[PDB]
Amino acid sequence: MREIVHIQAGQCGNQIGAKFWEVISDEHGIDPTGSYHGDSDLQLERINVYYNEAAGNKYVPRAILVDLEPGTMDSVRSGPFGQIFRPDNFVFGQSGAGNNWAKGHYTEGAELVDSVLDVVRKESESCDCLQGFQLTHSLGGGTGSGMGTLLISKIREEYPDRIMNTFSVVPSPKVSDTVVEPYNATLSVHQLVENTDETYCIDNEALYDICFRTLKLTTPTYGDLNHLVSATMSGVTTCLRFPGQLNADLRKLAVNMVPFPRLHFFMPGFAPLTSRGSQQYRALTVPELTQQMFDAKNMMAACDPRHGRYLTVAAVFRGRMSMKEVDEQMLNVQNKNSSYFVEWIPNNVKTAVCDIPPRGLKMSATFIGNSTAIQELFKRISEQFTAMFRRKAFLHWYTGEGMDEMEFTEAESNMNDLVSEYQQYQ
Amino acid sequence: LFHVNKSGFPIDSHTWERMWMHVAKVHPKGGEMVGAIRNAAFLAKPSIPQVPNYRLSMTIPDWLQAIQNYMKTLQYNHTGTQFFEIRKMRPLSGLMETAKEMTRESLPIKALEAVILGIYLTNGQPSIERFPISFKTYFSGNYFHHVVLGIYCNGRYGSLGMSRRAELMDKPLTFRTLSDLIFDFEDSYKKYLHTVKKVKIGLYVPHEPHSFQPIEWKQLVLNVSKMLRADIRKELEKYARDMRMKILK
Amino acid sequence: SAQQELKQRQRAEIYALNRVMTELEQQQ
Amino acid sequence: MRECISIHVGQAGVQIGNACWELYCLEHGIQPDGQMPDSFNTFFSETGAGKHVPRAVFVDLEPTVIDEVRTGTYRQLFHPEQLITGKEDAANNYARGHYTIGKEIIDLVLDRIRKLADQCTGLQGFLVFHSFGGGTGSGFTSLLMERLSVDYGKKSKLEFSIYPAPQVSTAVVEPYNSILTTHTTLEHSDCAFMVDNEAIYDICRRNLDIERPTYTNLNRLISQIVSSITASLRFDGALNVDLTEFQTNLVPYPRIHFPLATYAPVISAEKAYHEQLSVAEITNACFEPANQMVKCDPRHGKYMACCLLYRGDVVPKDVNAAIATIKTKRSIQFVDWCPTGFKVGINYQPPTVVPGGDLAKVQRAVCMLSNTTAIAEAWARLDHKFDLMYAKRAFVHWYVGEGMEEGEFSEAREDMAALEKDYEEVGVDS
Ligand SMILES: Nc1nc2c(ncn2[C@@H]2O[C@H](COP(=O)(O)CP(=O)(O)OP(=O)(O)O)[C@@H](O)[C@H]2O)c(=O)[nH]1
Ligand SMILES: Nc1nc2c(ncn2[C@@H]2O[C@H](COP(=O)(O)OP(=O)(O)OP(=O)(O)O)[C@@H](O)[C@H]2O)c(=O)[nH]1
Ligand SMILES: [Mg+2]
Ligand SMILES: [Mg+2]
């Protein structure tokens, strides 16, 4: 009950989802063959949130995988914990989108959408109480940016009463490996505003900075960044699966943190992140966790929180800890930083506490902030957009797929509209 | 004695006719102008004084002056009928609500609600600090009482308030000592051949508007008439030192 | 609607009356 | 032949009920499995073979806390039908608890009440436990109390709520829930006993010397107060005070029935040796402002009526002496229209201490209830919170999306303003 359907689109989404499933399975004590080899009874109590039982007393994830290039499925099945997925949930195209938004949403994306809605529908009648959906993808592409938005639009048509949780990776200016990011990014966020309840923006630049500066890694591959994102994802949905002193599911966060219907873009955090060398020079107390959460260098989106206020904040602690410590800490944190918090909301922190921490720690805390500083990112994207769209660069490829020109102007208008709306409350 | 409105607003029939009977009785000519104003088809609409706003450039003595001229502009009540019922022991927040609704309506004002208005206006300035002063005095075989609001901005003592008389309700920030201020009030009082008997001083009012701290009025009290002014000055300066260091509690 | 006109009349008459008694106190 | 049935709604109510039923099972000697190894009749039913069933109804729209109770150490105490569970929480939304998600469960609980109240002969009232901040504890309690009030017109209902603290808080939409619940708590219940978390945190930090207290300690203290209230119904003493007696003593006017509770002596096991803890000492400890379980200063108000439920080794002469010394003090200000303002009650059973907890095994204790006017501060602050948010219409779309109407938000505010005005206009002199 309160189950969640998980969908993965694009290479980035597929890899982050694979890491997320490895983390979740490790947390619940599931073998990579699908069997159970845990110790406690709390693991089985809410295993149905992310898993379906099967004959032979194994568990299969409730996951759907989509891409337009069959190589990603090959890598996912070959990789670790890839066998748990049942084969019929994989669906693939013939030729990838070629970083073309119009190709992954109009031309070849439509010819495969029916299978994904069919398997999603078949999974949604394999339950009784569905809380919502969640999708991992990248806005800088054609296979994740276009097909993803098409999929959420169709689903929101089907189930207006549920919720969606898109953990989208946004494109960064400096760390760019593509020439046509702004077009795809703007075209996707045109549709993300309306057909989604919570979007967690993630940036590769901020993740790389976290690995270099905090974890002191020498050669951070994509595995480490995917591990950090997976830790955040597992932190968000912990109160559905384990008991605590103050529970908070997805809808509680949605009502706490969405003051107005369109202001639902967040940037997460996580603590404690410590290098191997500095393991023994720390006390691991609630004040340390709270100081590390609100640090400007601990944000997962490449934005400066000092350049704007916080409409609303949440912090899902994890571990056996006092409640007075938490209440006094998230009170004095607001007291010292009154300039960084909005005056017309008397309380800005929605604190929740769980009891079961991660496997390798004693305490953790997933920080989720809703600040007016996020729009920084969008302005940068808009700048790049209006740099290329003025001279109509690379635009004939999108028109060749049947897309019209006015859609770009409409999406840019929506971008200015949303950025102004965030700017308003500051 | 003057009576008090207690029916909120508008004024009920009983207090209405009572006030009109009172003013008819006291006014020697009486019914002529009373009935003329009752049955006046059209009368001039009074203007709304605008509440001044604090500005950083202009100086603080001019700020106290400005509040004083606004209060003067508000046409001090001598109709003999209070319009806003005040309680001494009531918590401060109720008095802030009373002050803000009074500014909204902008009706005639007497000394007590005048000093409440002064507190409400000056509540926005941590540098400014204010407190109440009261006198119980004797004249013509009857006792009377008066209340004003003293201020201790920029290491200088000043006074605001209201009265039917002119110089008993307003002084500037030009006093080195509280004793000089109270003795100036005593001399102005003697100028009307009214004898002060007792003098009372309270405490600095807190700067938080929405609080339940009541207003103190009797923390210091002396019988000024009996004692010679030297001891009065000494005790008063001791008390002023005890106050400005926040020791008293 | 008529309540605000009632308050208008009340403040106008009481202002005029207060002016009259201020003049009388000047006489006294 | 003297009874009351308990309803626990929401996480806070269920978690307080855990401690409460632990305490009651401890006091009468009932094992966790309900098997004793006729004072229990107030809270337990005997059903042959010595099995004792509490008269409780555990309810929650979310199944996790009720499942925690089902798997806990008292799985064998309650019979299974009482533990009712929904499918999805109210999610801090009044409109989901009251209108949308409350409809599907309300009948299934009401009939259960109709069963329990049909097993008892004489019934004195109800003991409802809830929280104001939540979406379940507000909306579902509204629905349940409306239904019971239209059903049983003349049965007293005692709410034991948890009012939000001034500064400490754990939710962003608490004022909207509390202001909406103010209509049900007034006009349906009979005596609501407000409680804060910040006040009990301070009490545990200062008196008990605990630097890191969690919710278990707060629940234990609240359980001690409720067990003190429902003590004259179970044991016998010099003076006995049932529900309606102290209801007539406390509530002066029909619309002001919000007393604030207190307890004494709360002391650690170490400081007990250096303390005498006579009747005069504990009686004076109830009136100091550092022991009120609502974050408000009673020195800025007046006491309308008071009720001093003693228990343990006490005799009435000491109580009269202590009340005399209290009446001599000028700091403790009473109201002029209440020349006598103390309802005394003595009981012979001393307090009971849970083994896992941290409280001294004292020999006498007093529970003080006061219908003072200082409670308005605890309301006034919250109104300001509402005023700051509703001005911008923040979060209103969530509530209006669940079928709720917007005008109710202003209606609740004007009702609360009327309550504060009525509470202030009494207490004036003469
Ligand atoms: N944290 C991570 N970021 C990634 C990862 N892979 C890609 N990214 C970023 O994703 C961006 C593009 O992602 P994708 O290759 O998935 C675009 P997509 O596959 O959906 O379209 P097609 O290539 O046409 O199939 C790229 O600029 C990378 O900077 C990853 O594994 N982890
Ligand atoms: N004293 C005490 N208070 C608690 C406890 N648990 C939660 N609270 C209070 O409850 C408030 C939040 O409302 P909840 O009672 O948790 O809401 P709910 O009853 O679970 O209803 P839902 O939100 O729909 O789940 C917080 O402000 C806490 O102060 C507890 O165990 N003891
Ligand atoms: Mg690709
Ligand atoms: Mg709950």
Side-chain angles (χ1 to χ4, degrees), chain A, chain B residues 3-20 22-24 26-28 30-31 33-44 46-249, chain C residues 1-2 4-18 20-26, chain D:
Chain A
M1 338 168 261
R2 304 185 282 181
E3 295 104 336
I4 311 290
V5 179
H6 188 211
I7 322 169
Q8 310 165 355
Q11 190 187 274
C12 179
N14 270 268
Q15 289 172 14
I16 292 155
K19 185 61 61 143
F20 167 78
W21 278 117
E22 185 170 319
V23 166
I24 291 293
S25 88
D26 213 337
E27 203 153 327
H28 272 239
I30 308 300
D31 222 17
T33 73
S35 188
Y36 173 79
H37 290 317
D39 53 280
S40 175
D41 312 278
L42 277 69
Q43 296 168 339
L44 281 73
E45 216 185 14
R46 305 283 165 191
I47 200 165
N48 58 63
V49 167
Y50 282 120
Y51 288 81
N52 281 326
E53 218 200 328
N57 297 316
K58 74 184 286 187
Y59 299 84
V60 70
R62 199 190 284 92
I64 311 326
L65 292 75
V66 86
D67 205 40
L68 296 165
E69 147 163 19
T72 53
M73 318 315 169
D74 305 337
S75 67
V76 166
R77 71 167 71 261
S78 71
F81 276 81
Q83 298 293 87
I84 59 182
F85 305 113
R86 272 291 159 107
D88 41 358
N89 275 320
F90 301 162
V91 304
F92 27 66
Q94 310 306 275
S95 63
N99 265 232
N100 185 296
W101 191 92
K103 188 141 63 161
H105 194 285
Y106 285 75
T107 315
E108 326 328 333
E111 302 180 23
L112 176 51
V113 76
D114 319 293
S115 300
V116 286
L117 285 319
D118 190 356
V119 72
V120 159
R121 176 175 308 108
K122 181 215 70 51
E123 276 290 1
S124 148
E125 268 79 2
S126 175
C127 86
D128 47 51
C129 182
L130 208 54
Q131 182 80 327
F133 299 76
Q134 59 179 51
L135 161 63
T136 74
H137 66 318
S138 301
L139 315 184
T143 304
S145 168
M147 181 145 278
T149 50
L150 181 76
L151 201 54
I152 35 176
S153 174
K154 299 268 167 292
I155 293 166
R156 172 54 60 99
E157 202 289 327
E158 312 325 330
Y159 317 121
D161 313 278
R162 305 298 76 171
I163 58 181
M164 331 286 278
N165 278 333
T166 58
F167 288 78
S168 79
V169 173
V170 310
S172 182
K174 313 202 234 269
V175 179
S176 303
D177 319 334
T178 319
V179 190
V180 288
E181 293 181 353
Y183 287 14
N184 307 350
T186 286
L187 289 163
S188 179
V189 56
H190 172 76
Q191 294 292 76
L192 227 55
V193 168
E194 154 160 23
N195 303 114
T196 299
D197 296 7
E198 330 191 343
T199 320
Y200 301 95
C201 302
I202 305 297
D203 230 8
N204 266 314
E205 163 168 342
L207 292 203
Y208 273 123
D209 264 5
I210 287 155
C211 328
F212 284 160
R213 145 183 311 91
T214 306
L215 293 167
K216 300 295 210 312
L217 279 175
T218 61
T219 71
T221 178
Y222 279 13
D224 312 308
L225 291 65
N226 301 323
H227 182 78
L228 272 94
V229 173
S230 299
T232 289
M233 266 180 125
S234 167
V236 157
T237 73
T238 190
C239 288
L240 288 166
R241 310 177 268 135
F242 298 111
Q245 309 204 309
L246 185 58
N247 300 316
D249 74 45
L250 295 170
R251 212 180 277 285
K252 202 188 285 288
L253 300 179
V255 63
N256 274 281
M257 311 225 310
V258 180
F260 299 102
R262 318 264 285 279
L263 280 55
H264 63 275
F265 289 85
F266 320 92
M267 45 198 186
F270 180 68
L273 296 170
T274 63
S275 58
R276 202 56 50 171
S278 178
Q279 282 267 350
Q280 56 253 47
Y281 301 97
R282 292 164 93 272
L284 320 173
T285 60
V286 169
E288 295 177 345
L289 263 58
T290 50
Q291 294 335 309
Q292 183 158 15
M293 273 177 1
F294 285 84
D295 211 351
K297 54 171 270 202
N298 207 70
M299 310 308 292
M300 266 184 178
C303 283
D304 194 358
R306 272 68 86 62
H307 301 169
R309 312 176 104 72
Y310 283 112
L311 310 195
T312 300
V313 163
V316 181
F317 287 87
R318 294 191 69 192
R320 302 211 64 88
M321 55 182 54
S322 165
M323 291 290 324
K324 180 172 164 44
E325 275 193 304
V326 177
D327 285 356
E328 73 182 60
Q329 283 299 142
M330 331 285 278
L331 161 63
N332 57 54
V333 165
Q334 301 182 185
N335 290 344
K336 323 321 199 188
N337 302 6
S338 66
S339 49
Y340 303 156
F341 277 101
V342 173
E343 91 287 340
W344 54 268
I345 284 167
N347 200 51
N348 306 69
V349 295
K350 161 55 166 144
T351 183
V353 176
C354 170
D355 265 349
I356 319 306
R359 278 292 202 72
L361 307 164
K362 272 179 34 188
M363 278 177 344
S364 325
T366 313
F367 176 87
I368 311 164
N370 184 356
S371 88
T372 66
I374 200 80
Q375 89 300 29
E376 281 315 89
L377 267 162
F378 303 147
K379 340 201 62 178
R380 284 141 81 171
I381 292 284
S382 85
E383 295 277 11
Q384 289 187 339
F385 177 87
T386 195
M388 296 190 3
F389 172 75
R390 204 191 301 299
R391 63 208 267 172
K392 278 83 179 147
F394 309 89
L395 196 137
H396 82 82
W397 294 96
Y398 289 68
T399 63
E401 295 289 327
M403 192 145 156
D404 192 275
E405 193 273 330
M406 76 217 310
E407 288 60 17
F408 292 79
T409 36
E410 293 175 25
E412 162 49 11
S413 164
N414 287 33
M415 297 255 59
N416 318 118
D417 131 82
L418 182 135
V419 169
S420 73
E421 278 179 5
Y422 257 115
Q423 173 57 263
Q424 150 166 351
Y425 306 85
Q426 196 177 238
Chain B
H3 292 85
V4 177
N5 177 21
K6 286 182 171 47
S7 172
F9 268 105
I11 321 91
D12 112 280
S13 309
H14 276 168
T15 40
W16 191 264
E17 61 85 16
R18 196 216 74 73
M19 151 264 302
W20 283 109
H22 203 149
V23 76
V26 302
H27 209 338
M33 56 294 297
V34 168
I37 298 298
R38 293 300 270 287
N39 317 126
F42 157 70
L43 297 163
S47 66
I48 288 283
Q50 191 270 328
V51 170
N53 264 357
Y54 183 50
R55 295 300 335 288
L56 279 159
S57 65
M58 60 66 58
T59 193
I60 311 315
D62 173 285
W63 192 216
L64 300 175
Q65 303 264 350
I67 303 308
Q68 186 63 38
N69 323 94
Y70 174 108
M71 281 229 311
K72 282 206 294 296
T73 305
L74 231 49
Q75 291 97 4
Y76 163 71
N77 195 4
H78 204 116
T79 68
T81 56
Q82 206 84 13
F83 294 88
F84 310 88
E85 181 257 307
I86 318 304
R87 291 192 291 151
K88 297 289 206 75
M89 285 56 69
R90 181 169 172 182
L92 174 53
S93 310
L95 300 199
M96 317 297 329
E97 299 146 79
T98 325
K100 74 211 193 208
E101 61 85 24
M102 205 183 330
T103 56
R104 206 194 316 97
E105 291 196 350
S106 175
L107 260 53
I109 297 195
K110 295 216 185 283
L112 197 149
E113 66 201 299
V115 294
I116 295 295
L117 256 286
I119 278 174
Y120 167 80
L121 269 304
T122 203
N123 194 184
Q125 290 76 13
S127 78
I128 308 193
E129 179 47 65
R130 73 292 194 191
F131 55 98
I133 300 96
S134 161
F135 311 128
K136 184 192 172 171
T137 83
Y138 193 8
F139 156 73
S140 69
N142 44 306
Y143 303 170
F144 196 64
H145 34 296
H146 203 76
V147 176
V148 303
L149 191 79
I151 304 98
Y152 187 61
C153 155
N154 69 13
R156 214 85 70 185
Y157 287 102
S159 89
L160 267 44
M162 274 278 184
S163 181
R164 61 202 66 75
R165 312 307 198 190
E167 83 296 355
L168 272 296
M169 50 189 247
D170 40 350
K171 306 292 291 194
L173 285 168
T174 60
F175 290 81
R176 292 319 180 282
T177 81
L178 191 73
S179 58
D180 278 350
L181 188 69
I182 274 165
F183 297 162
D184 162 281
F185 269 94
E186 196 257 350
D187 306 318
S188 300
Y189 224 81
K190 184 40 57 193
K191 191 259 277 176
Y192 283 114
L193 273 281
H194 285 207
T195 306
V196 291
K197 304 318 294 193
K198 286 175 78 67
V199 60
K200 297 179 281 293
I201 315 294
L203 277 74
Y204 288 161
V205 190
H207 268 87
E208 219 296 320
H210 287 355
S211 60
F212 266 46
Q213 193 85 323
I215 314 309
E216 293 216 45
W217 318 79
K218 295 260 279 187
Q219 196 78 293
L220 168 140
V221 53
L222 306 74
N223 181 7
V224 68
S225 58
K226 180 167 58 46
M227 311 155 38
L228 58 90
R229 258 168 61 153
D231 171 289
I232 312 184
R233 151 167 280 123
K234 268 61 200 182
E235 153 57 285
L236 205 88
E237 291 325 329
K238 169 49 162 283
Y239 173 80
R241 294 221 321 300
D242 301 331
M243 166 176 354
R244 67 183 95 163
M245 311 295 198
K246 271 61 67 171
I247 292 294
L248 283 191
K249 170 152 190 178
Chain C
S1 64
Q4 303 59 61
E5 175 50 37
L6 182 63
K7 324 313 178 153
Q8 173 44 290
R9 290 252 304 162
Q10 285 174 333
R11 55 161 210 161
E13 307 191 302
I14 196 72
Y15 141 82
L17 172 143
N18 193 0
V20 171
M21 319 315 148
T22 310
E23 287 174 350
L24 152 62
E25 299 325 79
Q26 167 303 330
Chain D
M1 69 218 301
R2 57 226 185 288
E3 286 227 77
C4 46
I5 54 196
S6 311
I7 306 137
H8 303 272
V9 281
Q11 176 159 45
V14 169
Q15 283 191 325
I16 290 156
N18 274 117
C20 280
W21 287 112
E22 182 185 15
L23 176 57
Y24 304 132
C25 287
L26 218 75
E27 262 184 359
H28 297 88
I30 313 294
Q31 291 159 51
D33 65 335
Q35 279 283 109
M36 176 96 89
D38 301 278
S39 34
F40 59 84
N41 183 247
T42 295
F43 287 126
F44 300 132
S45 313
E46 214 166 41
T47 88
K51 191 74 172 66
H52 287 63
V53 202
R55 293 194 186 63
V57 191
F58 278 40
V59 179
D60 194 12
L61 300 168
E62 180 173 43
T64 191
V65 187
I66 299 286
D67 265 314
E68 166 186 283
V69 172
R70 284 168 182 160
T71 59
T73 192
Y74 295 126
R75 69 182 87 74
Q76 279 156 316
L77 178 55
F78 306 92
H79 272 307
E81 316 102 299
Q82 296 160 354
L83 314 175
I84 300 168
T85 53
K87 286 290 197 165
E88 59 197 350
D89 70 328
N92 263 69
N93 217 336
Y94 171 89
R96 284 173 65 76
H98 199 46
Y99 304 100
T100 325
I101 308 314
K103 144 69 151 163
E104 52 196 60
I105 278 279
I106 192 73
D107 309 64
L108 179 55
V109 53
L110 251 193
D111 161 279
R112 176 52 37 67
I113 297 282
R114 182 196 160 155
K115 274 188 185 105
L116 275 167
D118 276 32
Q119 170 154 327
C120 72
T121 81
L123 203 53
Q124 304 214 244
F126 295 70
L127 301 172
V128 184
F129 293 79
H130 66 98
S131 281
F132 275 106
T136 306
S138 282
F140 202 67
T141 295
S142 268
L143 186 60
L144 193 76
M145 296 281 278
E146 262 196 21
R147 292 286 190 288
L148 288 172
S149 179
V150 63
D151 280 25
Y152 317 139
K154 322 162 291 313
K155 292 291 222 303
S156 34
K157 293 163 265 285
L158 308 171
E159 329 195 320
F160 289 92
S161 57
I162 290 158
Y163 213 65
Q167 312 215 61
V168 174
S169 192
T170 67
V172 190
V173 291
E174 265 177 349
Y176 292 178
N177 291 10
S178 291
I179 288 281
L180 289 165
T181 320
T182 206
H183 170 265
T184 166
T185 279
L186 197 147
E187 199 263 8
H188 285 306
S189 86
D190 278 16
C191 267
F193 296 84
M194 305 309 201
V195 163
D196 303 34
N197 287 311
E198 203 175 357
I200 303 158
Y201 284 141
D202 257 313
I203 284 156
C204 306
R205 194 211 81 230
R206 164 161 41 270
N207 290 40
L208 282 157
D209 298 341
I210 292 280
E211 258 322 296
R212 301 178 226 309
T214 177
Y215 285 149
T216 57
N217 311 129
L218 285 66
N219 300 340
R220 284 165 162 156
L221 265 58
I222 301 174
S223 84
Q224 287 284 6
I225 283 187
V226 178
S227 155
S228 286
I229 297 283
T230 76
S232 69
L233 275 72
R234 297 173 286 153
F235 316 120
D236 40 346
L239 289 74
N240 302 287
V241 183
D242 63 345
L243 270 66
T244 197
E245 198 154 10
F246 95 100
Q247 215 163 80
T248 44
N249 297 123
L250 271 176
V251 182
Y253 304 98
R255 205 146 159 279
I256 51 182
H257 47 275
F258 302 88
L260 60 88
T262 313
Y263 191 70
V266 172
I267 57 136
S268 61
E270 192 294 349
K271 274 150 68 90
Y273 303 120
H274 299 106
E275 292 266 22
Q276 183 128 10
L277 305 173
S278 50
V279 170
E281 294 179 34
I282 69 189
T283 317
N284 285 300
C286 283
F287 283 92
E288 49 170 327
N291 278 8
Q292 313 304 70
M293 292 155 103
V294 187
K295 187 52 72 205
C296 70
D297 191 2
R299 282 143 70 252
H300 312 127
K302 299 191 182 308
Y303 294 77
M304 293 188 185
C306 190
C307 171
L308 268 167
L309 305 160
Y310 285 92
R311 69 183 294 180
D313 183 39
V314 183
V315 294
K317 45 172 271 283
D318 304 339
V319 179
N320 299 126
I323 291 159
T325 81
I326 279 154
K327 275 288 193 163
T328 66
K329 276 157 209 191
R330 63 178 218 84
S331 167
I332 314 191
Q333 293 289 341
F334 269 64
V335 165
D336 61 77
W337 52 258
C338 182
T340 177
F342 290 105
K343 179 67 179 88
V344 175
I346 294 98
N347 210 23
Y348 287 4
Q349 194 74 359
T352 287
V353 301
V354 306
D358 53 294
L359 264 161
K361 180 167 180 61
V362 308
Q363 318 211 97
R364 62 192 73 76
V366 51
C367 186
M368 196 263 286
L369 330 176
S370 298
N371 198 331
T372 173
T373 61
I375 198 71
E377 184 73 288
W379 296 329
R381 296 148 163 177
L382 189 131
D383 296 337
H384 183 106
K385 303 277 188 70
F386 182 91
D387 273 19
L388 271 174
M389 289 191 10
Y390 189 68
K392 316 306 303 312
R393 266 72 187 162
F395 305 90
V396 172
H397 71 269
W398 285 99
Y399 281 58
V400 308
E402 312 286 342
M404 180 144 214
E405 176 50 31
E406 240 288 79
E408 181 160 357
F409 269 96
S410 62
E411 287 181 10
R413 181 62 172 74
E414 61 76 10
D415 282 7
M416 202 46 198
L419 175 57
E420 263 153 7
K421 184 192 51 43
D422 293 351
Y423 223 101
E424 170 154 27
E425 71 76 20
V426 294
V428 297
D429 90 331
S430 290

